[PDB]
Design a protein around this ligand. Structure first.
Ligand SMILES: [Mg+2]
Ligand SMILES: [Mg+2]
Ligand SMILES: [Mg+2]
Ligand SMILES: [Mg+2]
Lengths: 432, 432
């Protein structure tokens, strides 16, 4: 049923090239684009770049686009496969690539087609996208997740000393998704004033994900600002905090550098135990109910130890890279208790659903996620609803590559109507 | 042919509520969203806000959405008007509102419906949107515009001292639109390094439109930074500069405050003659070929005097507010020679097209534009192509509410194929 596939180079939210795929069936044109991370774990499937330093600083993706146009497209068009057969199509592509990390075509080339196929499949069945995903995942129920807004940016997503990457607010106490959006926006706007008043207007510009990029170094200060904004906005009863440390970004031969954006100096490095205790103080002084990548992607010992003693949701991102094989090891060792789901870390919709199901079958929460480098594509909005994970982080309520997804979630809630369900305070396990 | 219309509240690129409209015909669903400015002129048509201080700090648009759902929609569905009749539909809504500035329904209410109608009409005619816009404007030809990238943000769009609003680069020397995008993107990434090396990481965060927000006070330094980045990227011979001063923002009862973001002090205000002398030096030292809003929206004498001796493109934005009446006065006084076209400054597709044709019939150039508060909507991309103006400003190549437009223009060029024309050095008036 796939009649034509044509790929092109477009631009992501940082102004870097990325892959976009147009797929045609008798029902019409289906288009999807691929995201790109900045703090990408070493185990992620390969994002293929041209590396021609004279063009886009080496970041063109014309090779990936060519892999689709000269190889994947004609193969898929010849097989005359039905777009609703997601698994067969994804597997064909995985087999054609033949490599462990999709380095022959690039995970960006394979994912672009995978996503477009999925969108075409939903319309093929005359059902909403989240419903089709629900079907493919084997879910009957569908639910709106609690949104986690990265409202203060640090690490590799912002120009400041702040070492930890994301400071998120989650309106778990909202009545529904739309109120969750209203609460997120109001706290965000109150925060701009809190920051402005203390550090001046120059501290209110934004980082890659729309969060403010204040010129601070102390991660505790980041948390303190969120708490103040929450209180000022009058939502202390409905908002909790989440963090994404992206510790792999400041891992230094065994230790950690909480000032890695300043000229190196090993004398300031701290040990994993020191970092673990720092988080515990954060968990003690602030409503922090979730921490992502508290340690390096392969510092397995620290992860297991922290997850066993922190008492909160611990999210694996670079640790697991949406990879069933890495996930299996994490479940066995209890390295974490939540999976960050990034379709582009593994490269296909099918492997992404497999990774989600493996995590969910083992009592893990699952938070669907965007990449710091996004596009106007809104696939993950339908994905988190169809996978019933109950939680999603897709940016601060600023910069449309973020709001496109939130707005889509608002449209899904509306479409679901009176029978719409919202995870709320049960985001970790929405379907008890 | 309009079977149904439903409006809803969504979020714009700054996290504030705005209007989105769904319109259905037998051909399907047609959706459009409305932009919102930050530095809005006093003569802009009314953007109706709820003004409920407890909700979104008074920025809700539930009232506008309701005017659509409860009044405009039922009326348009009853009249059984065909979507291809843009003018009749727009006039009907204008008559229903009955006010000069659309203060009953809100210009945001009428424009949302007006835009959805226009997209539906294109599909009804079985032709691309830009071709439909072209027919409505009476244009036989269609051409790709030179993009004007706002790469350093100041004024009311960023938390820096920098008073002037926008520092833009226009790749007039590019061979086609895709190279124009390449130049824009490469200069932007080089500029990030130039700013980082000279002012540090804290200077590399971004403003509302995706441009960097270094905390400099000197507008001239902003120009010097652009010049350096252009040189570093190696496109000195293909790029010229444009500026949006947004002088109405720092107008101070006759004088102008180029440090208006610092605590008020009348001792530093300058006269419009002194301000003009500053523009003259910019034009002498840098390849500045366009300046928007050099003076206040009603400082008519300064505009006439400057334009008469300038030699470059002078763009009216808050001066003309995409309003035929203001434009006519500006044409007669020779206040400027280019119209900034913002559909939400007047409120309808039909009036916007009338403003454009009025400017063109008088030999003025026309630059299609976004608002600092955007959405994932890409209507203006087709608009500028169909209106053949040759120039569009829709952001730095950063933040997807900007890239969605640039990406769409890349798609339009691709669809136009080998015959695609690009304004290039004839951007001021691709006609002639
Ligand atoms: Mg990361
Ligand atoms: Mg992460
Ligand atoms: Mg303005
Ligand atoms: Mg302006």
């Amino acid at each position: 049923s796939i009649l034509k596939i044509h790929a092109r180079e477009i631009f992501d939210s940082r102004g870097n090239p990325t892959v976009e795929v147009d797929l045609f069936t008798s029902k019409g044109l289906f288009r999807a684009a691929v995201p790109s991370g900045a703090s990408t774990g070493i185990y992620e499937a390969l994002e293929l770049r041209d590396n021609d330093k004279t063009r886009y600083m080496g970041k063109g993706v014309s090779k990936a686009v060519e892999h689709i146009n000269k190889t994947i497209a004609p193969a898929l068009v010849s097989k005359k496969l039905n777009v609703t057969e997601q698994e067969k199509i994804d597997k064909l592509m995985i087999e054609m690539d033949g490599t462990e990390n999709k380095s022959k075509f690039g995970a960006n080339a394979i994912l672009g087609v995978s996503l477009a196929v999925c969108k075409a499949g939903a319309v093929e069945k005359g059902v909403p996208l989240y419903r089709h995903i629900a079907d493919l995942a084997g879910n009957s129920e569908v639910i709106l997740p609690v949104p986690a807004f990265n409202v203060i940016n640090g690490g590799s997503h912002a120009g400041n000393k702040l070492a930890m990457q994301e400071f998120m607010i989650l309106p778990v106490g909202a009545a529904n998704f739309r109120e969750a959006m209203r609460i997120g926006a109001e706290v965000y706007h109150n925060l701009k004033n809190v920051i402005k008043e203390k550090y001046g207007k120059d501290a209110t510009n934004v980082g890659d994900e729309g969060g403010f990029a204040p010129n601070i170094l102390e991660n505790k200060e980041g948390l303190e600002l969120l708490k103040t904004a929450i209180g000022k906005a009058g939502y202390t009863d409905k908002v909790v905090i989440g963090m994404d440390v992206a510790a792999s970004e400041f891992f230094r031969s065994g230790k950690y550098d909480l000032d890695f954006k300043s000229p190196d100096d090993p004398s300031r490095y701290i040990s994993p135990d020191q970092l673990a205790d720092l988080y515990k103080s954060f968990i003690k002084d602030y409503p922090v109910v979730s921490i992502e990548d508290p340690f390096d992607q392969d510092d397995w010992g620290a992860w297991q130890k922290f997850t066993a003693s922190a008492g909160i949701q611990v999210v694996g991102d670079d640790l697991t890279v949406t990879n069933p094989k890495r996930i299996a090891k994490a479940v066995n060792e209890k390295s974490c208790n939540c999976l960050l789901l990034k379709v582009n870390q593994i490269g296909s919709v099918t492997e992404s659903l497999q990774a989600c199901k493996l995590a969910q079958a083992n009592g893990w929460g699952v938070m669907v996620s965007h990449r710091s480098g996004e596009t106007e594509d809104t696939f993950i909005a339908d994905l988190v609803v169809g996978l019933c994970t109950g939680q999603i982080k897709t940016g601060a309520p600023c910069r449309s590559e973020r709001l496109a997804k939130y707005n889509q979630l608002l449209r899904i809630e509306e479409e679901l109507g009176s029978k719409a369900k919202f995870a709320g305070r049960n985001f970790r396990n929405p379907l008890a």
